[PDB]
Symmetry: C2
Subunit: 176 residues, 2 copies
């Protein structure tokens, strides 16, 4: 599968050199595929990057499905090989605000994850596991917010110590 | 005060063009000061950037002092003119992990803020406002984590709606 070779390779060139530093030539080196093979499949570097971001959204969506966003974060605690790639995701923050087409592409590529959270939370509410003194959307934004904070600290090299107890506290904050 | 002119100007060139895009020539344009005047004061672009980051640490430290990290975040909700600069801070995440000298410089430049949090939390514990079923350091990491999540969502252009209720919930999670 040539698409999946390109994506596994790209995730590494990106992880090691960052967004700007993943040149087309370096992306050939990491993938064993030509400029033409790469752009044929994905059009441009930005769409390649978004496809990877979609892969994270699809895997996180499965995890969320099973056991919510606390579980994604628990898993993030176990996957230190993923922190360089998380760095890259944070680098494009500026573009996510200066560029409406990219921003819309980013949001669309994240939609599978966004839907899974809504479904997971809805089923939790349906089963009476979530606290009902706080609106569910506030719980949602709360957990989104902790997630983004987790990605950021891990990305920036902060220690993982006490984050596990932070997670126990996040759970307790939103459950009955 | 030529140092403070350079810093006010730099904060804007950075906010508008991002880290890479704030060239030396553009930083002259934003500041009205020469390459030589800029490097005389700060040595290099990285130290200039760190000085700005220290300015945030010093202002946040004051706010934290008064009313803790929830208050910094409440203020962040009121300061949408600051979100482009927050973007820039997130761009260097990758360097914060690939570069130990920068990482140490970053941490040292943040130390005034880190100390203020410890002092604020210690005085809260001393006055019996914090919950005592959870270790205080876990509360600390929790609040650090929410903060970084707040910076990240605002930076990336997410909406500020329900973050205010998120803050009420964060407060309630850590107080008695
Ligand atoms: Au690379
Ligand atoms: Au959940
Ligand atoms: Au996971
Ligand atoms: Au990720
Ligand atoms: Au600029
Ligand atoms: Au506090
Ligand atoms: Au503030
Ligand atoms: Au800031």
């Amino acid at each position: 599968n040539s698409r999946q070779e390109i994506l596994e390779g790209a995730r590494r060139c990106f992880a090691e050199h960052g967004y700007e530093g993943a040149t087309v030539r370096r992306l050939e080196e990491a993938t064993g595929k030509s400029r033409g093979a790469i752009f044929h499949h994905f059009g441009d570097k930005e769409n390649l990057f978004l496809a990877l971001a979609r892969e994270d959204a699809a895997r996180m969506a499965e995890v969320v499905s099973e056991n919510g966003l606390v579980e994604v974060m628990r898993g993030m605690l176990e996957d230190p090989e993923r922190y360089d790639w998380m760095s890259v995701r944070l680098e494009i923050s500026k573009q996510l605000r200066t560029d409406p087409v990219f921003r819309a592409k980013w949001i669309d590529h994240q939609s599978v994850l966004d839907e899974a959270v809504r479904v997971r939370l809805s089923r939790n509410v349906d089963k009476g596991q979530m606290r009902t003194d706080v609106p569910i959307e506030v719980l949602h934004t709360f957990l989104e917010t902790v997630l983004d904070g987790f990605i950021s600290r891990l990305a920036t090299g902060a220690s993982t110590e006490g984050l596990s107890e932070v997670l126990d506290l996040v759970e307790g904050t939103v459950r009955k």
